[PDB]
Amino acid sequence: MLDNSFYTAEVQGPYETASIGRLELEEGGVIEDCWLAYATAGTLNEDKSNAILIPTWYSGTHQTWFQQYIGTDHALDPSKYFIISINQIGNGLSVSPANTADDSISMSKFPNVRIGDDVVAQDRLLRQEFGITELFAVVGGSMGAQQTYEWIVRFPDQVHRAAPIAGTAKNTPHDFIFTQTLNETVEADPGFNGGEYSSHEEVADGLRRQSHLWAAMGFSTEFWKQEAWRRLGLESKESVLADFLDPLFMSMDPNTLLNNAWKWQHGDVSRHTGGDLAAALGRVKAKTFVMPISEDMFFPVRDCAAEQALIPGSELRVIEDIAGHLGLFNVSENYIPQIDKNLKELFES
Amino acid sequence: MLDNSFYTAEVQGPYETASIGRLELEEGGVIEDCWLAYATAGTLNEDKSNAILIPTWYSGTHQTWFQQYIGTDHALDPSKYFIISINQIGNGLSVSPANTADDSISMSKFPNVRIGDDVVAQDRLLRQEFGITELFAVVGGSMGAQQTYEWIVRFPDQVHRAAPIAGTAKNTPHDFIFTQTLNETVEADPGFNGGEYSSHEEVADGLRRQSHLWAAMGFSTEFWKQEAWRRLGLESKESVLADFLDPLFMSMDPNTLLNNAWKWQHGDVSRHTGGDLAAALGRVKAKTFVMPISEDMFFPVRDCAAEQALIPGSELRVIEDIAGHLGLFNVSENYIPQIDKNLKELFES
Ligand SMILES: [Cl-]
Ligand SMILES: [Cl-]
Ligand SMILES: [Cl-]
Ligand SMILES: [Cl-]
Ligand SMILES: [Mg+2]
Ligand SMILES: [Mg+2]
């Protein structure tokens, strides 16, 4: 076990943990004690029919959702819904390479986990802890959208509404390559020590490089050209890196990123239907709003629109944001208003 | 001095070298013996009025131009024009960090060179070796386009026609950041040794990582999604890296790449007019066809269209290509026909 203050309640906000027991992974690995970190708001009604699940994204947790997306002034309204965010396996809050007490899967021995494993694990947690057998909606961004897609394909009758924001049901070759460069730059740091480092601070250079890779692909050319980063209260593009992006990624655990990156790379709901993507998305019964971000460079509108065309009864709702993919962080004035408007209309479906 | 077979006439095709003497650089540095590598096709006529200059791009030489762009079936017709490509200072063929006999500027001591320094050096070479004082056309791609823009702003009366392909006159913040990630991944290789390596093979990992960065930003999402690389005779996306892109970049000299990358980052014709880009491009007298590639991710059409609007008498001629920026390599079936049509129309003006 490693000590990283970033993966604590003080930084991420309060959360709970619960073990679902033994989890056999699709790739063949086993997590004997699979425990998950989750945070909730609101109250489950009598029929337990008002639950909303929020999967977390790469390098993220439940934090951004409770801070930016959730509130009585938002669509994700805790006065109406039992809202629960369940942290990804390996994401640093749930059972992960650097926090597991199981030596057989500690650090560099931690097994490959697929999107499918998270969804199975989440289903078990919801049933075990809350007796939730159906979800009012599943809402997630990026990797959270991947998990959202996996939910409505794997358990079609258990989800009534779906909001995959800025993500795809089947990972594309370009996205795969992009994520590979993220992995390569962390592994390139000699402090990484093959994933058996004594502290994340030893991989600071690798993590800083990944941040700069996110600066290049995570926003847009116009974001930088128009200096939209000024609404962060910063005075130079170099400051955006040095005082915001870099400290964020340098706070994270390398093995957590590498694990979740592998999961991200291999996201594919067509595994359920022999590689037939149309057949997989054809299984969807949840009312689905596909919501890409306009300037997203690696989850572009055309990729999400192509998948939306395969989902029966679905709608395409483009989120306009100059900040591209990292608009998920809510760095633009009209981001949350667009999210709230679309989610409200979805929740009325 | 280092021996690298990649930087020879055998690999790049026949060329010559000539010294233009002492060159004082804009950044304050000095190249006492500034010699340039150049390649020609065709014959300069009596009044020296049929000369076309082709600046070279990052990591490239005259090779791709003579192989893909030049011929009697092309607009760049050697039976009509004296076509001369002059290699960038520091590009491995011209005087460079790894080939200079001047120890004071060898390897990590090699000074910062700007686009403006190249254009001054080229003007001198043309005047000195051929008595050329005016150019029928200047044609260049990417960094070659930057040099093209610098030519028509710095020496407005010396260029009759200009064809900046896939490049801008003043570099944008996003492009700067992208190029920074290229430099960082080379510098991250411990074999680089602060630019004092004994062989480029010692920086193989760094060069390979940069190749993968080019895979992510140098094409487009659709290029990979449609597997457009299959018409290159490659059978997997992994092969595109391992069998085409990686061996190419692993053949190159790190100090050459870093030098030309710095040059690329700081390209700015507005230096001539106190930072006023509109005033700089307002000087242009050459008939100019601004030709961005439709899917170019870091020299996007909107960036080039914005600049074309400031150049009097110019036209915007978008090149449609799924391959994005690296469409410059001529990897698409309809690339050269678009280039030829536009250039012929330019040359007929
Ligand atoms: Cl993500
Ligand atoms: Cl978060
Ligand atoms: Cl270039
Ligand atoms: Cl070349
Ligand atoms: Mg709020
Ligand atoms: Mg030809």
Residues from chain A that touch B181, judged by Cβ atoms under 8 A, are 209, 212-213, 216
Reported as type and span, the H/E element at residue B347 is helix B335-347
Show residues of chain A in contact with B219, CB under 8 Å. Answer: 174
Among A82, A99, A86, A83, smallest CA distance to A125 is for A86
Residue B1, classed as helix, strand or coil, is coil
Breaks in chain A listed by the residue before each, with C–N > 2.5 Å: none
Q: Rounded distance, CA B73 to CA A234, Å? A: 54
CB of B44 within 8 A of CB of B131? no
Name the structure determination technique.
X-ray
Compute the distance between CA of residue A255 and CA of residue A96 in angstroms, rounded to an integer: 8
Cβ(B35)–Cβ(B95) under 8 Å? Answer: yes
d(C-alpha B216, C-alpha B273), whole Å: 35
Q: Give how far B36 is from chain A: nearest CA, Å.
A: 33
Q: Which residues of A touch B220 (CB under 8 A)?
A: 174
Residue B38 in 3-state DSSP? Answer: strand
Residue B55: phi and psi, rounded to 5, are: -65, 155
Calpha distance A191→A196 (Å, rounded):
9
Instruction: Compute and round to an integer the Cα radius of gyration of chain A.
Output: 19
Which segments within A11-136 are labelled E, that is strand?
A: 16-19, 23-24, 30-31, 35-41, 51-55, 82-86
User: Which residues in chain A have Cβ-Cβ distances shorter than 8 Å to B184?
Assistant: 185, 209, 212
Contacts of B290 (CB under 8 A, 6+ apart): B164, B304, B305, B307, B308, B311, B314, B315, B316, B317
Calculate the CA A93 to chain-centre distance.
13
CB contact under 8 A, B225 and A176: no
Task: Residue B298: list chain A partners with CB under 8 A.
Answer: 221
What are the residues whose beta carbons fall under 8 Å from the beta carbon of B40, sequence distance 6 or more?
B16, B82, B83, B84, B85
Residues with Cβ within 8 Å of B236's Cβ and at least 6 positions away in sequence, in order, are none
Closest CA to B141 of B335, B326, B347: B326
The closest CB to that of B300, out of A174, A184, A221, belongs to A221
Cβ distance B215 to A177 less than 8 Å, yes or no, reads yes
What does the H/E/C string look like for A295-331?
Answer: CCCCCCHHHHHHHHCCCCCCEECCECCCCHHHHHHCC
Measured from the alpha carbon of residue B76, the closest ligand is: 6
Which tokens belong to B217? 């930003």
Give me the long-range contacts of A98-102 (CB less than 8 A, separation at least 24): A98/A1, A98/A2, A98/A4, A98/A200, A98/A253, A98/A255, A98/A256, A99/A1, A99/A2, A99/A7, A100/A1, A100/A33, A101/A1, A101/A33, A102/A31, A102/A32, A102/A33
Q: Which residue out of A106, A142, A220, A332 is catalytically annotated?
A: A142
Across the interface, which of A177, A205, A224 has its CB nearest the CB of B174?
A224
Task: Label residue B20 left, alpha or beta by phi (over 0 means left) and psi (-120 to 50 means alpha).
Answer: alpha
Question: Phi-psi bin for B224: left (phi > 0), alpha (psi -120 to 50), beta?
Answer: alpha
Q: Which of A172, A212, A297 sits opposite B224 (nearest CB)?
A: A172
Active site residue A118: no
Q: Which ligand is nearest to the CA of A70?
A: 5
Question: Which of the listed CATH numbers 1.20.120.1200, 3.40.50.1820, 3.40.309.10, 3.30.1330.10 matches domain A1-349?
Answer: 3.40.50.1820
Cα(B26) to ligand 1 centroid in Å equals 44
DSSP for B121-184, please give it. HHHHHHHHHH----BSEEEEETHHHHHHHHHHHHSGGGBSEEEEES--SB--HHHHHHHHHHHH
Q: Which DSSP state fits A66?
A: I
Q: CB-CB: which of B216, B222, B227 is closest to A178?
A: B216
Q: Please state the separation of Cα B227 from the chain's center in Å.
A: 27
Instruction: Give the number of whichever ligand sits closest to the CA of residue A63.
Output: 2
Identify the residue whose tokens are 């990156």. A261
Q: Strand A23-24 relative to strand A30-31: parallel, antiparallel, unpaired?
A: antiparallel
- Identify the CA nearest to A138 among candidates A150, A128, A124: A150
For β-strands B82-86 and B51-55, DSSP reports them as parallel
Q: Do A188 and B205 touch (CB under 8 A)?
A: yes
Q: Which class for A333: exposed (0-12), middle (13-18), buried (19 or more C-beta within 10 A)?
A: exposed
Nearest bound ligand to the CA of residue A58: 1
Q: Does B298 touch chain A (CB under 8 A)?
A: yes
Gap between the Cα atoms of B127 and B138, Å rounded = 15
In the block, which residue shows the tokens 């760049």?
B76
Q: Among candidates A162, A142, A89, A157, which has minimal Cα distance to A120?
A: A89
Distance separating alpha carbons of residues A71 and A69, to the nearest angstrom: 7
Please report how the helices B143-154 and B254-265 are oriented relative to each other, as an axis angle in degrees rounded to 10.
50
Contact A181 B225 (CB under 8 A): no
Measured between beta carbons, which residues in chain B are less than 8 angstroms from residue A216? 174, 177-178, 181, 217
- Please tell me the distance from the alpha carbon of residue B117 to that of residue B150, in angstroms, as a whole number: 10
CB–CB of A221 and B172 under 8 A? yes
Backbone dihedral angles phi then psi of residue B291, each to the nearest 5 degrees = -125, 80
Q: Which residues pair with A86 in a beta bridge?
A: A38, A55
- What amino acid is encoded at B130 in this protein? F
In this structure, the number of other CB atoms found within 10 A of the CB of residue A79 comes to: 9
Cα-to-chain-centroid distance, residue A328: 10
Hey, is A148 helix, strand or coil?
helix
Specify whether the CB–CB gap between B127 and B119 falls below 8 A: no
B229 and B240 in contact (C-beta within 8 Å)? yes
Contact B289, B318 (CB under 8 A): no
Tokens 């006999």, located at residue: B101
Residue of A nearest to B218 (CA): A174
Q: What is the largest CA-CA distance in chain B?
A: 54
Are B270 and B295 contacting, i.e. CB atoms less than 8 angstroms apart? no
Amino acid of residue B58: Y
Residue contact A223–B297, C-beta within 8 A? no
Element (H, E) at B264: helix B254-265
Among B174, B212, B221, select the one facing A225 at the smallest CB separation.
Answer: B174
**Resolution, in Å, please?**
1.8
Contact check, Cβ <8 Å, A222/B188: no
**Cα→Cα distances B325→A75, B218, B321, Å:** 41, 5, 9
Could you give the CA distance from residue A49 to residue A131 in angstroms, rounded to a whole number? 11
Q: Which two tokens stand for residue A216?
A: 């290049």
Question: Which amino acid, A192?
Answer: F
What DSSP designation does A84 have?
Answer: E
Radius of gyration of chain B (CA): 19
Distance B61 CA to ligand 4 centre (A): 4
- Active-site annotation holder among A296, A303, A314, A332: A296
The residue type found at B268 is D
**B-contacting residues in A 301-330 (Cβ below 8 Å):** 302-303
State the DSSP code for A132.
-
What is d(CA B303, CA A271) in angstroms, rounded to the nearest whole number?
A: 41
Number of H-type helices and E-type strands within chain B: 13, 10
Long-range contacts of B129-132 (CB under 8 A, 24+ apart): B129/B18, B130/B44, B130/B48, B130/B51, B130/B84, B131/B48, B132/B44, B132/B48, B132/B51
Chain A residues in contact with B302 by the CB 8 A cut-off are 221-222
Which residues partner with B38 through β-bridges? Answer: B16, B86
Q: How far apart are CA B96 and CA B59, in angstroms?
A: 13
Give the whole-angstrom CA distance, residue A131 versus residue A331. 36
Contact state of A173 with B298 under an 8 Å Cβ cutoff: no
* Structure tokens belonging to residue B198: 């004994």
DSSP per residue over A210-237, as a string?
HHHHHHHHSS-HHHHHTTGGGGGT-S-H
Which two three-digit tokens encode residue B185?
């991944």
What one-character DSSP code corresponds to residue A67? I
Give the 3-state DSSP-derived string for A153-210, with helices as H, strands as E and coil as C: HHCHHHECEEEEECCCCECCHHHHHHHHHHHHHHHCCHHHHHHCCCCHHHHHHHHHHH
Whether A296 is a known active-site residue: answer yes
Please name which of A126, A1, A129, A7 lies closest in space to residue A62, comparing C-alpha atoms.
A7
User: Cβ contact (<8 Å) for A174 and B224?
Assistant: yes
Distance from the Cα of residue B209 to its chain's centroid: 21
Return the amino acid letter for A225.
K
Give the 3-state secondary structure of residue B272. helix
Q: Considering only CB atoms, which chain B residues are within 8 Å of A209?
A: 181, 184-185, 188
Q: Could B181 and A237 be called an inter-chain contact, meaning their C-beta atoms sit closer than 8 Å?
A: no
Q: How many CB atoms lie within 10 A of CB A195?
A: 18
Q: What residues of B are annotated to the active site?
A: 142, 296, 325
Which ligand is closest in space to the CA of residue A71? 5
Find residues 205-264 of chain B whose CB sits inside 8 Å of chain A: 205, 209, 212-213, 215-217, 219-225, 227, 237, 241
Q: How many CB atoms lie within 10 A of CB A312?
A: 11
d(CA A19, CA A36): 6
Which of A213, A221, A298 shows the shortest C-beta gap to B181? A213
Rounded to a whole number of angstroms, the distance from the CA of B59 to the nearest CA of chain A is: 20
A71, A87, A127, A209, B180 from A229: Cα distances, Å: 25, 28, 42, 19, 18
Count of Cβ atoms closer than 10 Å to residue A33 Cβ: 14
Helices (H), B268-334: 277-281, 301-308
CB neighbourhood size of A265 (10 A): 17
Cα separation, B104 vs B106, in Å, equals 6
Ranges of each domain in chain A: 1-349
